[PDB]
Amino acid sequence: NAFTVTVPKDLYVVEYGSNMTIECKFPVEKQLDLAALIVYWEMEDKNIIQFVHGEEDLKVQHSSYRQRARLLKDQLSLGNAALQITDVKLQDAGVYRCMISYGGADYKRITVKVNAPYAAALEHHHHHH
């Protein structure tokens, strides 16, 4: 089977101010070959995290993500590229792409929607026809 990146789901609904972890899975047969693995997460035109030769390149990460966005590295040997972003903001809503090279290469898109703090209380404020 061709090299395929999978997503557990393609839409995350997250609360403003929470921490979110979004995931892309890739095939790893036995032990992970870190020399081979390249991971890049992007949203809009912003570098969220790139990972190559076993390390994150934080000098290329967009400044809005400093101290906020990382890969859960220990998940990579399980074939899981798990991006955690702390203290989610309204402007974190949008379309994210995970790009993975591990011999073969593929990518997926994930949408994030962010609920503001009073969204639940106001859900039934005023419905319309």
Binding site: I38, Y40, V52, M99, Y107
Partner: peptide
Amino acid sequence: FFXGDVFYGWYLCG
């Protein structure tokens, strides 16, 4: 994103 041809065509940064 700046790595030669890696992911060329898939990203917007740069």
